[PDB]
Amino acid sequence: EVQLVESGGGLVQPGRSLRLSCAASGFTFDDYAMHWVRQAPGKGLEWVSGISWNSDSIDYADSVKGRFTISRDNAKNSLYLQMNSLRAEDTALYYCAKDRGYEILTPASFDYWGQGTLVTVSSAS
Amino acid sequence: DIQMTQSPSSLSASVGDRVTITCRASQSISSYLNWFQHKPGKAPKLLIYGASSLQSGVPSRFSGSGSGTDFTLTISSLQPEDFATYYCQQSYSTPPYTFGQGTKLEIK
Amino acid sequence: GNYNYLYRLFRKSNLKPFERDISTEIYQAGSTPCNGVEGFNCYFPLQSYG
């Protein structure tokens, strides 16, 4: 019954920054951990980043260390993510998942997901 | 480091068949596996959290088992609306949330 | 991961030789004013090496 919708999908050039956000409405956003999952066009799922219920612990995937910056806004009940120094391998599909617990690295998995928004990293029209 | 593998690659069955999918982990994870049903046209969902704990809100047709280094998932009937891609994820080892490769499933 | 080292990504104009920038205002990427609130086309200029 919860809704996980995001925005910001589009076409950007390599080396250009793009910011994604995600709106959650169907649950209590103040005390759940949240994560980002990437769906490659010709591969399987992959975890990107995750933040705690409040911003003490932030973790990043190895392939995106020092390139992405995930934020959080509990007042507006929405989270953000910054994509910087993009290369050609970041043309995948991104989901906005929700963790069952309140920490980043726990045996609790992602219970609710949302529809993805496709992004492209190329120089075209 | 942990490597996550899926033994089968593609299956084909009928409306009233019974199929088995297995997922092998490189190292012991102590029954901390998760299964997801990836519908190709919409957002993926979660079927079983933990070893064989059935998530509330899904039919009891699915049932899993296994602990240690081998896990198995079975579909009781495989109704025509259950064709999708399934993933196994571990959340115990140092590499966080490593997903296995897909299992495309067509009913025929 | 060491996050004590940070590098700036955006600035209105190029730096002159031998000066520093310390201000950390939100970079206006487009035409919608940021007004001190981060949003679309309102990016953070400092990112840390992983």
All residues at 6 or more sequence positions from A54 whose CB lies less than 8 Å from its CB, including other chains: A72, A74
d(C-alpha B107, C-alpha B79), whole Å: 9
Q: Which of C1, C9, C38 sits opposite A17 (nearest CB)?
A: C9
Could you list the residue range(s) of the whole structural domain that residue A62 is in?
Answer: 4-121
Instruction: Give the CATH number for residue B54.
Output: 2.60.40.10
Rounded CA-CA distance C34/C42 in Å is: 6
Residues recorded for chain A: 125
DSSP state of A16: -
Residue type, B15: V
| Number of structural domains in chain A | 1
- Our CA-based measurement puts residue B44 at a distance from the nearest CA of chain A, in whole angstroms, of 7
Q: Residue A40 sits in a domain of what CATH number? A: 2.60.40.10
Question: 3-class SS at C8?
Answer: strand
| B72: Cβ contacts below 8 Å, ≥ 6 apart | B20, B21, B22, B23, B64, B65, B66
Tell me which method was used to determine the 3D structure.
cryo-EM
Domains of chain B: total: 1
Resolution (A): 3.4
Question: Which residues of chain C have a Cβ shorter than 8 Å from any chain A Cβ?
Answer: 1, 9-10, 29, 38, 40, 42-44, 47-50
Position A42, amino acid: G
Q: Is A82 on the interface with C (CB under 8 A)?
A: yes
Which residue range is the domain that position B34 belongs to? Answer: 4-107
For chain C, state the CA radius of gyration: 12
